[PDB]
Design a protein around this ligand. Structure first.
Ligand SMILES: [K+]
Ligand SMILES: [K+]
Ligand SMILES: [K+]
Ligand SMILES: [K+]
Ligand SMILES: [Mg+2]
Ligand SMILES: [Mg+2]
Ligand SMILES: [Mg+2]
Ligand SMILES: [Mg+2]
Ligand SMILES: [Mg+2]
Ligand SMILES: [Mg+2]
Ligand SMILES: [Mg+2]
Ligand SMILES: [Mg+2]
Ligand SMILES: [Mg+2]
Length: 46
RNA sequence: CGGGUAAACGGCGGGAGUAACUAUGACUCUCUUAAGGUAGCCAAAUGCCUCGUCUUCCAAUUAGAGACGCGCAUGAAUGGA
RNA sequence: UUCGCAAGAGUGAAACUUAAAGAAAUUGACGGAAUGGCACCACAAGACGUGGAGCGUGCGGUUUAAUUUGACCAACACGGGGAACUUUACCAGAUCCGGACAGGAUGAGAUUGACAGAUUGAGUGUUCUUUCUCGAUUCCCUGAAUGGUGGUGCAUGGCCGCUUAUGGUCGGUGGAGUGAUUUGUUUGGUUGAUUCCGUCAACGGACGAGAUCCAAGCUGCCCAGUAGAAUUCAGAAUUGCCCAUAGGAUAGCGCAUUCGGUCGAAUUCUUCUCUGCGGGAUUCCUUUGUAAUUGCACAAGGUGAAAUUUUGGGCAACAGCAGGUCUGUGAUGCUCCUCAAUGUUCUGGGCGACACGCGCACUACAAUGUCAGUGAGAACAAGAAAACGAACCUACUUGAUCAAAAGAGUGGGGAAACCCCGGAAUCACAUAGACCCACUUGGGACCGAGGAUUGCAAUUUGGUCGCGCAACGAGGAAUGUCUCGUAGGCGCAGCUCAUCAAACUGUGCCGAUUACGUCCCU
RNA sequence: GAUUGAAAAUCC
RNA sequence: CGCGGGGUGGAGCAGAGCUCGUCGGGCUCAUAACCCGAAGAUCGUCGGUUCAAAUCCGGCCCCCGCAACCA
RNA sequence: CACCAUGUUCA
């Protein structure tokens, strides 16, 4: 069958991405997205 | 020239491989003869090697006996046992 | 120990070994036993092969990172298995969770996604730097869950193959047995047939066989504006004396033939065609046949479109098989993996790599041929699209003031309407055509240069010019299939399918030899 | 290792 | 010591030949038997001589022998 | 009346 013979890795284990927490980011802030529906995170507009 | 006859005189093979450990080899090839030694028997008054090897006999055995047998070169009225 | 010349005879243990050894019946199975049948998956008589060559494909080895795997008569163009990606199950990587749900640790920052720069094979937030954006959807770890073309077809379902193409199979009640078991289900004839007839310790049944069924013939009703015909009125074309190159043969002797564009009108009809139900064949009829000496039948001939299961199919009892399939499935039991996954996606490679062996194909070895013309001619079929047409198939034109392969345009067809009057290839030709017995204008293996086209991808597939000096001149031992519209030859369609049939499932075309037997072989 | 239903054998 | 003899496909053997073996394909459910095919020895060795050498002739190197005597 | 041998162990 598909034996789990395991695998040797030539690279380090890439970490799981974690969202950066900006406590009270609203207090810190600023340009409003010009895009009608919307760097602008919503439209990725640079 | 063609037959017969060995209780006529006499004669009576070699090499190579092979079993689920290893040996050795039932087995198989191959060369060969007139026939390739049968039954027996043996280091025998017959064996070179040889004071063969094992057992037995002695404190000690190139001796004796019983085995064994690749028998220089045992063997059937050249009579064998 | 006794006896014997001997050979031996008489007497006669044990140690140790071992779960059976035997005996008679029954049912199978087997026989280089007998008997009667039967089958070109057997043979006889044949016919076309195969095995020899090139090439396609499958299988095995060899190799490889991986060259995924099943299967070994009844595996080997089989898995509908013609794999560019996908498929794909294999290999080198890289994503996602598609871990529901419950309990924790969080938390209106739980979270989600990201531009750029580099990470990388990746103008892959994949992860990072970096800030944005999303918002209770999700994270975290604990059990759990889930998926798997993971395993095991020797755990199974279902299906298929095979036994097993033949005539087989099983109760009941009665009879016979101590019983397993037997009789019915017997033998004789008959038959493809456990098909009938006769017989009968059986008598009644049930299933297979046959019947039914679906196509091919022949025919009745129906039927046509998705099928045809024949007339009649026009419109037209040829029109007579006509003798090839050398020009044979082969009907014609009120009213000469032609013209699916002449897109002609009119009228009538169903010869062909369409097709739902009908019919038709039953050994029916006939032998101073065979048989019978009741029968059941049979052989010839007749009649007929068809004359014996009319023909080709389908269906097919009862037992089996550790046959195949856990790679068809939300068929599954038990197991294995499960978040750097045996899940899932994406990228690159493999499934097609070669010295070889084998199965099955396709093309050859030329003259009953090969080129190059002309002619006449089938059938089976398939066609376009979700949450107004467009994809699909076509004809015709053009490209064309100039190869093919293309590429355009314009129409038509949802398919008895278009394709289509379906110009299939075998085939024909008195074509006064080329070649002339050679591996050659036979044969195309294999390779070079250009260009097209399918496709996301061609490092696919046509077409053109080279190459041919690749074998191969008919194939040893062997060995397949086949009896009439058959073998063989020849095309065509469907299918898989973006592209690609030496495959298969159908279909028409042209059309033989032989046998009409037999148990030698199997 | 393959093989097998397990072994043996064989190859590997 | 002398005196001889003989050295060849993997094997046993001729003078490359034969037999067996080997390898490929049949035949078999398979194996053997069998059938059809393929390969495998410049011949102890070396040198000379010969057109040319397994051969001829030497020299070696083995094997096998046969003799190896006579108060 | 030519020849015509054999099938590892359990299951
Ligand atoms: K006595
Ligand atoms: K006695
Ligand atoms: K024989
Ligand atoms: K034996
Ligand atoms: Mg003797
Ligand atoms: Mg002696
Ligand atoms: Mg003494
Ligand atoms: Mg003595
Ligand atoms: Mg002696
Ligand atoms: Mg003597
Ligand atoms: Mg299996
Ligand atoms: Mg099985
Ligand atoms: Mg196929």
């Amino acid at each position: 069958g598909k034996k789990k013979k395991k695998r040797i890795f030539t690279k380090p284990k890439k970490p799981t991405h974690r969202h950066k927490l900006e406590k009270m980011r609203a207090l810190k802030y600023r340009q409003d997205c010009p895009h009608p529906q919307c760097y602008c995170g919503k439209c990725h507009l640079t």
